[PDB]
Structure formats: structure tokens, C-alpha cells
From a paper:
The IM sub-complex comprises the ATP-binding cassette (ABC) transporter LptB2FGC, which extracts LPS from the IM and delivers it to the periplasmic components of the Lpt system. The LptB cytoplasmic subunits form the nucleotide-binding domains (NBDs) that capture and hydrolyse ATP. LptF and LptG possess transmembrane helices that create a cavity and a translocation path for LPS, as well as a periplasmic β-jellyroll domain.
Three distinct conformations of LptB2FG, designated as LptB2FG-I, LptB2FG-II, and LptB2FG-III, were captured in our cryo-EM data and solved to resolutions of 3.34 Å, 3.26 Å, and 3.31 Å, respectively. The main difference between the three cryo-EM structures of LptB2FG is in the conformation of the β-jellyroll domain, which appears to perform a rigid body rotation motion with respect to the outer leaflet of the IM, transitioning from one conformational state to the other. The TMD and NBD domains of these three structures are essentially the same. This cavity has a volume of 5,473 Å3, approximately half the volume observed in the X-ray structure (10, 513 Å3), suggesting that the previously solved structure may represent an LPS-bound conformation. Intriguingly, our structures of LptB2FG exhibit an open V-shaped cleft at Interface 1, oriented toward the outer leaflet of the inner membrane, while Interface 2 remains entirely closed. This structural feature is expected to facilitate lipids entering the TMD domain of LptB2FGC via Interface 1. The distinctive structural attributes characterising our cryo-EM LptB2FG structures strongly suggest that we have captured the resting state, or substrate-free conformation, of this transporter. We identified four lipid molecules in LptB2FG-II and LptB2FG-III, likely originating from the nanodisc preparation used for sample reconstitution. These lipids were modelled as phosphatidylethanolamine (PE) moieties, arranged on the outer surface of the LptB2FG complex.
Residue numbers in the entry:
A (entry chain F): 1 to 365
B (entry chain G): 1 to 354
C (entry chain B): 1 to 240
D (entry chain A): 2 to 240
Write the structure that this text describes.
């Protein structure tokens, strides 16, 4: 009961330090991405310490399992190098007992990760989306440049104005090409709403509010002779910020209570994804105890980068399987539990390698 | 001092080559995994593999300084942990001579880096990007994300793909009249540059007289185009500013300066590509200071971990200070000089402390 | 009265053969030394007895109970202790906690039994005056005494010391020899391997010389120092 | 020549390790540096070598004062050094091992370097292993090649660090033979080691350092009869 709270203190302290460093690095990378986007002109520099503040729970929920993995590796490597566990084993301590000692901090980490996954990351993502969409820090239409075109997604929508003025009114021409990605063969969905005057307005009720002062709308695809001419005024079209919708979807912000009774495959796949991040905690706890056996020649730091690569592969495989799930291909009965079982089996292979070798040698003689 | 120089140089060179190989392999694997997301019918597995393998020299040239730093750390720590540098110092060989011995291969390495980044990386990068665009872009008038848009007097052109040898794909022209009516909307499969002539082969224009009549689709077999789009300029705009050669970057910076646009994004690329030797020299100097100081007895894994962490921090700072120069008001030169400057300062400090 | 018998041990690293048919035997209350040239199979034999190296041939049994295939904790539960060469004290645990962390795992002791055992181990080894200092603030002698008391806390039948007279002052070997004599008086079959031939042969009442992976000699100090083969391959002709 | 360390001192964090230790190694003299492990003996050895910056005192090699010169400056002044661990150039052959240091010497030309290499190979009986890589050498051959390489730089004093460390009683004869061969050349060997008996045997004068102070000096007989030494370091039962 003394070794228990000795190992559980070492592991927790090392995990805290590693998690802090990893969080700093990940936040820095996301900040370089958002700063480059703001440099391009599609963001408000003032609204940058809330975008990063509302994304911390997701980074923490993705980092804490890796923090525990590396903390277990470092702490138990230190104990192995200092001849401190050879005297625990030479007095009676098993390796299943070591696993049982290690599974106590893993429970606290799993509880923290489960809370972050099921009740705090959805709220943070919801608030982040609320800000970036509703509060319209500055829309892309407030960054127009005369003579230069502007596009979105796969060039599906290209907005351009010939004249740019401080009053933002009576613009020479609004060349907008709102194209449907799929609208069947006969109609390509590509339409041009060009007006003699640019009617930029308050843009408050429906986010970016845009209407044509005079109106000249054509739905005729250039390939065929079918021309759809609407020379009347074009009705108000509501433009959302592509950045907010591109990275954050509705599935990442719905409350967890709405996923239990849902039938939409996306919601069920998201629920299965949420109840997995606590599970990597136990999986990597089982994967880490056998791997932390080191020699003074190897040291603690030799197998940290391979562990990071293994964890990243785990996460990538989980994300890919979730995509194949909510796309309707993989049946929802099996889910991501087969990936979880694959990595659990890898961990069990690592754990029982030495007992298997000893039992094989015993029967050989 | 010939045998010692060759010994140290060979060790450092081999370590740097191995580290560069491993880093490039990891980068290529990550790039392929990311590119798998945009798989499609027109863009197959073979096309993605070809693009990934064709953008190898660009990644190698970009990641050369990190390979130099980590390889110098590993190779010099191999000698330091074996007490083979204490013997050199106790035989009368100073620290400056060891630094120069390590630095001699670095000159040839950075010369090769400059040569590749000016002659080989732009060529293969242009070949690769053009290919991905041709594959992912032959569908229709507005299909690809890698397209280009331009404005004439009243015409509006959208080129789906821009290929090196003055040939475009999916050229679409909208010719509005004075009353903003669609006088003619056309789509052409290909084009060819012949001085002032652009030949829009396979052009199917759909002109419309707005005097209450139907649009007449006309199948012209070949059309002349009075385009003011020079292919040499076209290849530059569709390419990232960091994927251009040093000479091409210089020419485009001056061309942008003449008209009056903002070339501060291209000055950063010019400084990054030109001042690379100084950055690698500062990184290897700090690695040498690390070996002679804190890490003269630690194991190989700790040296690799420290090198990776320092490289990550250096790249994060470099990428943070790039857009910061454009959003704020300070020259882009300080976005390249500062990190290498403090790295050299720390290396000199730790070397002076012996 | 126990007996730790190693019979026909053999081990082959790479394709070469390091150890070849080395047979040992340590009784209870007996001090045995395992000496030999550095390149020979002395350390390999010691580790194969300890459990850190798996013997290819041969068996290791204590009182008609094969422990050759058991892991290190299996041997430890069978009654075979082990004390590593370097410092192996719990750095952040007090001296009393060092012994109590091992006393708490004994299934034949209750709370009162653990209390009395800790008191006895503290008084017997004269470490009671430092029963609250952290293990990282102990000198060499106190550290060694605390390590030996911690090893005894698990009640072993045999203790295998690995280089006890390693990097210690001539005054410090007196404390180590006193501790070893105390262990022999308690009834524990110590086995020592060391580079220091003089003090090992002084303290040990029986020695085994292993050269070229074979047992080339056996006997007390007088028989070892009067052997032509040992004086030829190990000690030279000018030893003492 | 004569190497003098005077009034040496060195204080680590907070505490003091070495306080006013003074030695003197002549030419053709074998001198030991013994004492308890904790005391400032290794620190004094390293401060003489040049691996630790002395806070006070002066290290003078003959007339020159080299207390401020770095390790390579001291080595150019004529102070050798042989580390305890293996320090042979692993990927270089034995002849290349000696030659890589012979090329450093500036007073030798090509023919002189060749003749010196041949003499060094013949003198230490390594002429039959001159084409073996440094990583494929046994302990005795490796130590002989290391000593030859140390001599290749033409030093005046060689400061051996733990020569009799973890070696068989057979090999101490070879080590003593090499040390006496070096002394016969005119080199002021200085040995610090844990092995008290062997060091007191081979040496001619000993320096005991306890609690950062020189508590005894002189030949082996006077060292073994000293009461203070017999009470702090050796013990009353030591021979
Ligand atoms: C600003 C940028 C972030 C901060 C930069 C790093 C500052 C702190 C790093 C200190 C490193 C010190 C070191 O190397 O020693 C390991 C340390 C102490 O060990 P020591 O006492 O040397 O043992 C002998 O042992 C420890 O306890 C180490 C704890 C520190 C955290 C370890 C590193 C974890 C993060 C590694 C990231 C690598 C890249 C991964 C990227 C993908 C992420 C998904
Ligand atoms: C010593 C260090 C030890 C470190 C060990 C580390 C081990 C890590 C192991 C985990 C690896 C995780 C790899 C994740 C792969 C993700 C693949 C993916 O996202 O594929 C999806 C892609 C999309 O295609 P789809 O949506 O079907 O589109 C149809 C078009 N109409 O679907 C496809 O079309 C994909 C078809 C297959 C293509 C090949 C996939 C290559 C991945 C190789 C990974 C190898 C990693 C190293 C082992
Ligand atoms: C279209 C182009 C496509 C390019 C794709 C390239 C993909 C490469 C990915 C695989 C590379 C893995 C290599 C990892 C090897 C690590 C293993 C190791 O320890 O190697 C050590 C090895 C020993 O060398 P040895 O001969 O023993 O040296 C002593 C001799 N005096 O040391 C070695 O010398 C072996 C390692 C050599 C690695 C060479 C590869 C890196 C250099 C190329 C960089 C990329 C540049 C491409 C374009 C260049 C144009 C000029
Ligand atoms: C923002 C922080 C980024 C940090 C990145 C990761 C850094 C890891 C550093 C690991 C190496 C140091 C390990 C220290 C172990 C404990 C100290 C020790 O034992 O060494 C002794 C040494 C004194 O010896 P001496 O070298 O003579 O001075 O004691 C020392 O003096 C130790 C000195 C350590 C100096 C570390 C310098 C790091 C420089 C990072 C440059 C990043 C550049 C990119 C960012 C630019 C931002 C503008």
C-alpha cells in the first residue's frame, strides 16, 4: 500500500508535466494556422484569444491519454534505470501486480477524459461556433479588393466587385458565381447574380445579408442552349463564414443526451466516438507497462517517439473507421470496437511475451 | 590534421544522411495519408502516389536544416560518449578546430541544398502540381479547386487547369454586354499560346440575343482568343511563393513592386530560401554546443529526443513569425534572422562555458 | 536447512558458448564466493542463478523445487533474495518506509507482527537513529545497511550479493564483512561475486573459480591459492 | 621539468570541496593521489588535468604558468591524460590510431612522422595488430594502443585515471610494466585509483587527500604508518 501511492504519485506528476508541454505545442501549432488565415485576411485579429480558448477542451481530451502514456514510460523507465524495480521484483512483486498498481491513476485520467469528452468539449465547440458565426467578427465580404476575385470551397462560389468604396454602396458590379456542386446533368446549378449597384447592408439578422439593387440572374449553363434568365431583382442570399462551418460541424456540438436516442448514423457514430477516448486511456495503460522495461544502455527516451507514432496511428485509424461508419459503409453493429480490440490484443501480446517465452522454454526441456 | 578531420566529417555526414532519410520517409507517409482523403474516380491511388513521390525534393530541401541539426547531434554524441573527443582535446586540438572539422561537410551539404532548391525542387514541384490539377480538373466549366479566374474588359475567364507549356484546360468565358445581359457564354477544352494567338479548340459557345429569342448553341471547331494572359506569368500565380526558384522569386518580387501590389509574402520566401545556410550553420553550432555541454554523457535516445524537440520549437517559432510580419508592421527579414540569431547566441554562450 | 543447487548450467550468446556445464551448491548458513576472470562465465553463472538470465541447459532448484523456469518474483517467493550492485534504495521514501513497503507484502504477518518486525529490523541493524531520513540523503554505509534490512524484510533463505566490495574505502569493508557475518549467523546462505579477490577470499569459506565457461577449482582460500591452474590463468604467480 | 599545483581550491554549490591542496610531480617520478571517495581527490586530479576550473591556486608546468589555459592549452604545455573508460578510435586502425595524433604534432615532417610511427609500433609490441580496427581489440592490446597514442603527442606528464580498475591480478603486472617503462623515459606519471595496495606499490610518493586537505605525504612506508591516515582512510587492520 506504500508502493501503490509511490508509483501513483510518480506517474501522475510526470503525466502532468508531459501533458502541459504537449498542450503548449498543440496550441502553438493551431495558432500558427489561425494566424496564417488571419494574414490572408479572412479573420479578425481581435477574436483570436477566444477561438483558442474555446478549443482547449478538445486538445486536452486528445492529449491526456498521450500524457499518461509518456508519463508511465518516463516514470517507470526512471525506476528501472535506478535499480529501484529490480528490488521490488526480487522481493515478490509480480507484473500483474504492477499493472494493478498502474491502473489506479489510469482511472482518474479516464474519468477526466470522459468528462471532457461528454460534457465540456461539446459546450466549448458550441460556444466557438456561436462566436465565429453569429458575432460575425468580420465577414469575407468586408475584405473585398477591387479587381481581384474571391472564391470558396472548390471554387463553387466566387465573389468579386469591380468598385470598392468606403460607403460600401453603389458598387460598379457584383460578379457572384454561386454554383451547386451537384444539380443533375441538365441543370449545373451555376448562376450569376450581377447588379449595377452593390447593396451591402447591415448583415445582422441572417449573418451576411446580400441583395441585388437592380437584379440580373442567369441559371443557364454555358454548355447547353438551355438558358434561364431572371432579370428581376435577386432575393436576399445568406452567406455563412466558410471557416466556421469547414472545421466544426453540427455533430461536434450536439449535446450527448441527443445522441442516445438518435437514429441518424452520424449521431450514432459520434456517440461511439465520444465513448472511446476514455477507452484509449486503459488501452495505452496496458500497452505502456510492458514497454517501460529499459536498460541503462537504452534509457528512458529511446522509445518515446515510436510511442507517439503508435498513438497517432491509433487516433488516425479511429477517425477513419468513424468516417466509414457514418458514411453508411461499415455496419454500426461492429463500430470502432474492433480497432479498440486490435490495439488491446497488441498490448496483450506485449504483456504476455515473457511469460509465453518462459512457458515455451519450460515445456521444451 | 587529416585523419581526424576525415573521421569527424564522415561520421557527421553519415548521421545526417540517415536522419534526413528517416525524416523524409515520415513526411512522405504523412503527406500520403492526408492526401488519401481527397481520393476520387479521376484522382486514383496511382496519381496520389505519383504526386507524393514527385514532391520529394521540395520536402527534403525544406527539412534539410532539421536533418542537419539532429544528425550533427547524433554523430557528434557518438564520438563524445565514447571519450573520443576528450582524447582530441588532450592531444592539443582546440574546440574551434573541432567546430571547423564538423563545419567543413556542412558547407558542401548547404551548397547542395542551395543547388537543389534553385534548380531541382521548382521543376519537380511544378511537374507534380500541374499533374494533380490536370487529373482533378477536366470535368466541366467549374469543377476543380486548383483553377484560376481572370477578368478582361467585360469577359470573365475561368481556367480549370494551367499546364507548363502554355496550354490551358476548361477555359470558360462569360461575355456580358453593357446591360449585363449574357451576350455569350462559352467553354473550351484546351488552348495554345502562339504569341498573340490563343486557339480555343473544342469550343461550344452559347450566345443569346436578348431580343426575346432562344439561345443558339454553336459548335465552333476552332476559335482565336485575344487573351492578355502570358503563360510565364500564369505559371507563377498558380504556384505557391515558397515553391518558386530564387531567381523567379526575385523577378516576381520586382514585377509586383512595379505595379504597386504587396510583395511582402514573396520577400519572406526570398529571405527564407537565401538565408538557409546561415540557419543551418546556427543550428549545427548550437548542436555542437549541446554536445560539448549538457549532452556529453547522455544516451543516444536523449540526444534524438532533444534534437526533435528543439527542431519542433524552432519550426513553430519560424511559422509563427511569418504571418506575424504581415499582420503587424515589421520587415520580413526579422522573421528569419531572429530565431537563428538567438540559436547562435545560445550556442556561443554554451561553447564559451565549455 | 536448505540447499540451493545449480546443476549442469549452460548458456550460449550469439553462436559462441559462454558457459559450459558449471555446477554449484550453496547450503544454509554458508558463505560462498564466485570468482574468475572477467571474460569467463562468472557473471553469466551468477545471473543465471539470480534469474536475470535464462539458462539454456541445466536446472536450478532449491529444496527439490525447480526454480529454473520461474521468473524473478517466483524465485523471490521461493526464498532467493538478491541485492543489486549500484544504489537501489527508494530515493523518495523514508528509511522506515523502505522496510515497511516490503513488510506489508508478507502474508504471514499481521499489523502487530509488521510493527514488531520493523522495530526488530531497525534495532538490529543500528539504523533506528535515521528512521525518518529520506533514502536520497543517506551515506554509503547507512544506505547499504538499509538495503540489507529491506532485503531481510521479505525473509529470504539465500541472499545473492553482487559486488559488495565495489568502490568502497578500506574502512568500509569492515562494515560489509560485519553485515555478512551477521547474515551467516542468522542462517542465510550468502553467495558473493566480486572483482576484489583478496577480501572475497577472506570472507568466503568456499570459493568457485570459473574460467573459459568451466569450473576449474573449488575449495577454501588455502586450496585456491595453492592451485597451479588458478595461479596460471587467474591470479598470476606473484599473488600474495 | 616539474609540475606544481599550489593552494588549489574549489567550492561547489554552497559547500567547499577542496581547500588548499598543494602537490608537486617531478620528471621520472611516479606519484599517487589517494583518499576517501567523498573527499576532494578526484576534483584535485581533474583541476590538475584541466577538466574542472579551479577557483584559486596556480598550476605551473616548470617556468610556465598554465592555470588559465584550457585543456588543449595545458596539453600543448605538456600534460597528458588517459581516461578510465575505453577511448580508442573505434573505426580507425591501430596504425591510423597513432597516426591521427602524430599528424597533429607540428615539429615533425613526413619522414619524421613515419619513423616515429614505426618506432612507437615496435616499442609497445603492437606491430602485429597494426591493421585491426580499434573496436576489435582485447583489453590489454587496447590499453597498450591507448598508451602508445598518448605518447604519440610527446607529453611531459601523463595523468592516468584509475589504471587498475576492474582488471584481473594477471593484468596489473602488465600495467605496472607499462608505467615503469614510461617512467624510464622521463615522464612524470600521476595515478589516482581506488586500489590502495597496487597504487602504494607502484608509486614512489603518495598524496592522501581527506576533507579537501592534504593529510599525509611521502613514501609507502610512511603513509602506512601514519596514525591519522590509519584512522580516517585505511583502518587499523590494513596490513
Ligand atoms: C515553448 C515550447 C514548449 C516547451 C519546450 C520544452 C520545455 C521543457 C522540456 C525539458 C526537457 C528536459 C529533458 O530533456 O530532460 C527530461 C526531463 C528531465 O530529465 P533529466 O533530469 O535530464 O534526466 C536525466 O524529464 C521529464 O520529466 C520530461 C518532461 C517534459 C516533457 C517531455 C516532452 C513531451 C513532449 C514531446 C513532444 C515531441 C513532439 C511530439 C509532437 C506530436 C504531438 C502529438
Ligand atoms: C518502430 C515504430 C513503430 C510505429 C508503429 C505505428 C503503427 C501505426 C498503425 C496505424 C496506421 C493508421 C493508418 C490510417 C490510414 C487511414 C486511411 C484512410 O483514411 O483511408 C480512407 C480512404 C478514403 O477513401 P473512400 O472514402 O473510400 O473514397 C472513395 C472514393 N469515391 O480510403 C481508401 O481509399 C484507402 C485505401 C487503402 C490505401 C492504403 C492505406 C495506407 C496506410 C498505410 C499505413 C502504414 C503505417 C505503418 C504500419
Ligand atoms: C523522386 C525522389 C524520391 C525520393 C524518395 C526517398 C525516400 C527515402 C526513404 C527511405 C530511406 C530510409 C533510410 C534509413 C536508414 C537508417 C538505417 C541506418 O542506420 O543507416 C546507417 C547507414 C550506414 O552507412 P555506412 O555505409 O555504414 O557508413 C559508413 C561508411 N563509411 O547510413 C547510410 O548511409 C544509409 C542511409 C542513407 C539514406 C539516404 C536517403 C536520404 C538522402 C536523400 C534525400 C532526398 C533527396 C531526393 C532528391 C535529391 C536530388 C539531388
Ligand atoms: C523556449 C524553450 C525551448 C526549449 C526546447 C527544448 C530544450 C531542451 C534542452 C535540453 C538540453 C539541456 C538539458 C539540461 C539538463 C540539465 C542541465 C545539465 O545537466 O547540463 C549542464 C549545463 C551546464 O554546462 P554548460 O553546457 O557548460 O553550461 O547546464 C545548462 O546550461 C543547460 C543549458 C540548456 C540550454 C537549452 C537551450 C535551448 C535553446 C532552444 C532554442 C529554441 C530556438 C527556437 C525558438 C526561437 C524563439 C524566438
Amino acid at each position: 500500500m506504500i508502493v501503490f501511492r509511490y508509483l501513483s504519485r510518480e506517474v501522475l506528476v510526470t503525466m502532468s508535466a508531459v501533458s502541459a508541454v504537449l498542450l503548449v505545442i498543440i496550441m502553438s501549432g493551431r495558432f500558427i494556422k489561425y494566424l496564417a488565415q488571419a494574414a490572408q485576411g479572412l479573420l479578425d485579429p481581435g477574436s483570436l484569444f477566444l477561438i483558442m480558448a474555446f478549443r482547449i477542451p478538445g486538445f486536452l481530451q486528445l492529449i491526456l491519454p498521450l500524457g499518461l502514456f509518456l508519463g508511465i514510460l518516463l516514470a517507470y523507465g526512471r525506476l528501472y534505470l535506478e535499480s529501484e524495480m529490480t528490488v521490488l521484483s526480487a522481493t515478490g512483486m509480480s507484473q500483474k501486480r504492477l499493472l494493478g498498481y498502474t491502473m489506479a491513476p489510469a482511472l482518474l485520467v479516464a474519468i477526466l477524459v470522459a468528462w471532457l469528452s461528454l460534457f465540456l468539449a461539446p459546450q466549448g465547440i458550441n460556444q466557438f461556433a456561436l462566436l465565429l458565426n453569429k458575432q460575425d467578427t468580420l465577414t469575407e465580404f468586408d475584405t473585398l479588393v477591387p479587381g481581384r476575385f474571391q472564391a470558396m470551397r472548390d471554387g463553387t462560389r466566387v465573389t468579386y466587385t469591380e468598385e470598392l468604396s468606403k460607403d460600401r454602396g453603389e458598387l460598379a458590379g457584383i460578379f457572384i458565381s454561386q454554383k451547386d456542386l451537384n444539380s443533375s446533368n441538365q441543370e449545373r446549378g451555376i448562376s450569376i447574380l450581377v447588379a449595377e449597384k452593390g447593396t451591402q447592408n447591415i448583415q445582422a439578422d441572417g449573418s451576411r445579408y446580400l441583395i441585388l439593387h437592380n437584379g440580373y440572374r442567369y441559371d443557364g449553363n454555358p454548355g447547353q442552349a438551355n438558358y434561364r434568365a431572371i432579370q428581376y431583382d435577386t432575393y436576399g442570399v445568406m452567406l455563412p463564414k466558410p471557416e466556421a462551418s469547414s472545421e466544426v460541424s453540427e455533430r461536434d456540438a450536439v449535446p450527448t443526451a441527443d445522441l442516445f436516442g438518435s437514429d441518424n448514423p452520424r449521431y450514432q457514430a459520434e456517440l461511439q466516438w465520444r465513448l472511446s477516448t476514455p477507452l484509449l486511456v486503459f488501452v495505452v495503460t496496458l500497452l505502456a507497462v510492458p514497454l517501460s522495461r529499459v536498460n541503462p544502455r537504452q534509457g528512458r527516451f529511446l522509445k518515446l517517439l515510436p510511442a507517439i507514432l503508435l498513438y497517432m496511428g491509433y487516433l488516425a485509424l479511429l477517425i477513419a473507421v468513424r468516417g466509414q461508419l457514418d458514411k453508411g459503409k461499415i455496419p454500426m453493429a461492429i463500430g470502432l470496437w474492433w480497432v479498440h480490440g486490435l490495439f488491446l490484443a497488441i498490448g496483450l501480446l506485449l504483456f504476455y511475451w515473457e511469460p509465453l517465452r518462459l512457458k515455451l522454454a519450460s515445456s521444451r526441456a | 590534421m587529416v585523419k581526424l578531420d576525415r573521421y569527424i566529417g564522415v561520421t557527421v555526414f553519415v548521421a545526417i544522411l540517415a536522419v534526413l532519410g528517416v525524416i523524409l520517409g515520415l513526411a512522405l507517409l504523412f503527406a500520403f495519408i492526408d492526401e488519401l482523403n481527397d481520393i476520387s474516380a479521376s484522382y486514383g491511388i496511382g496519381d496520389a502516389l505519383r504526386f507524393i513521390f514527385l514532391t520529394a525534393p521540395r520536402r527534403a530541401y525544406d527539412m534539410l536544416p532539421m536533418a542537419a541539426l539532429i544528425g550533427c547531434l547524433v554523430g557528434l554524441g557518438t564520438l563524445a560518449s565514447n571519450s573520443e573527443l576528450t582524447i582530441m582535446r588532450a592531444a592539443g586540438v582546440s574546440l574551434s578546430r573541432i567546430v571547423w572539422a564538423v563545419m567543413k561537410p556542412m558547407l558542401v551539404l548547404m551548397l547542395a541544398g542551395i543547388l537543389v532548391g534553385e534548380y531541382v525542387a521548382p521543376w519537380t514541384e511544378n511537374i507534380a502540381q500541374s499533374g494533380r490539377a490536370l487529373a482533378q480538373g477536366g470535368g466541366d466549366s467549374q469543377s476543380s479547386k486548383r483553377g484560376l479566374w481572370h477578368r478582361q474588359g467585360r469577359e470573365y475567364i475561368h481556367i480549370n487547369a494551367v499546364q507548363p507549356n502554355g496550354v490551358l484546360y476548361g477555359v470558360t468565358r462569360y461575355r456580358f454586354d453593357e446591360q449585363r445581359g449574357l451576350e455569350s457564354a462559352s467553354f473550351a477544352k484546351r488552348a495554345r499560346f502562339e504569341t498573340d494567338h490563343w486557339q480555343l479548340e473544342e469550343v461550344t459557345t452559347t450566345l443569346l440575343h436578348p431580343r426575346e429569342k432562344r439561345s443558339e448553341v454553336v459548335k465552333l471547331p476552332t476559335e482565336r482568343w485575344d487573351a492578355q494572359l502570358s503563360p510565364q506569368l500564369l505559371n507563377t500565380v498558380v504556384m505557391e511563393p515558397e515553391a518558386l526558384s530564387i531567381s523567379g522569386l526575385w523577378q516576381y518580387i520586382h514585377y509586383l513592386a512595379d505595379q504597386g501590389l504587396n510583395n511582402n509574402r514573396y520577400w519572406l520566401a526570398f529571405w527564407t530560401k537565401v538565408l538557409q545556410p546561415l540557419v543551418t550553420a546556427a543550428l549545427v553550432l548550437m548542436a555542437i554546443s549541446f554536445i560539448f555541454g549538457p549532452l556529453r554523457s547522455v544516451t543516444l535516445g536523449q540526444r534524438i529526443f532533444t534534437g526533435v524537440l528543439v527542431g519542433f520549437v524552432f519550426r513553430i517559432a519560424q511559422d509563427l513569425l511569418g504571418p506575424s510580419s504581415l499582420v503587424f508592421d515589421f520587415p520580413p527579414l526579422l522573421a528569419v534572422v531572429i530565431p537563428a540569431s538567438i540559436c547562435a547566441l545560445a550556442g556561443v554562450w554554451l561553447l564559451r562555458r565549455a | 536447512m536448505a540447499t540451493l543447487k545449480a546443476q549442469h548450467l549452460a548458456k550460449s550468446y550469439k553462436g559462441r558458448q559462454v558457459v559450459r556445464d558449471v555446477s554449484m551448491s550453496i547450503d544454509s548458513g554458508q558463505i560462498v564466493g564466485l570468482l574468475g576472470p572477467n571474460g569467463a562465465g562468472k557473471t553469466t553463472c551468477f545471473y543465471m542463478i539470480v534469474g536475470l538470465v535464462q539458462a539454456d541447459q541445466g536446472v536450478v532448484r532449491i529444496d527439490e523445487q525447480n526454480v529454473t523456469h520461474l521468473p524473478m518474483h517466483g524465485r523471490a517467493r521461493a526464498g532467493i533474495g538478491y541485492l543489486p550492485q549500484e544504489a537501489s534504495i527508494f530515493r523518495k521514501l523514508s528509511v522506515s518506509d523502505n522496510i515497511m513497503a516490503i513488510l506489508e507484502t508478507r502474508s504471514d504477518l499481521d499489523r502487530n507482527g509488521r510493527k514488531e518486525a520493523l522495530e526488530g529490523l531497525l534495532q538490529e541493524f543500528h539504523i533506528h537513529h535515521i528512521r525518518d531520513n529520506l533514502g536520497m540523503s543517506l551515506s554509503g554505509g547507512e544506505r547499504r545497511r538499509v538495503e540489507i534490512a529491506r532485503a531481510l524484510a521479505s525473509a529470504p533463505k539465500f541472499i545473492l550479493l553482487d559486488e559488495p566490495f565495489a568502490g568502497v574505502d578500506p574502512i568500509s569493508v569492515g562494515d560489509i564483512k560485519q553485515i555478512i557475518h551477521h547474515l551467516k549467523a542468522k542462517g542465510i546462505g550468502i553467495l558473493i561475486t566480486d572483482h576484489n579477490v583478496r577480501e572475497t577470499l577472506d570472507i568466503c569459506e568456499t570459493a568457485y573459480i570459473v574460467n573459459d565457461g568451466q569450473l576449474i577449482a573449488e575449495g577454501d582460500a588455502e586450496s585456491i591459492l595453492a592451485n597451479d591452474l588458478v595461479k596460471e590463468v587467474y591470479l598470476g604467480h606473484e599473488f600474495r
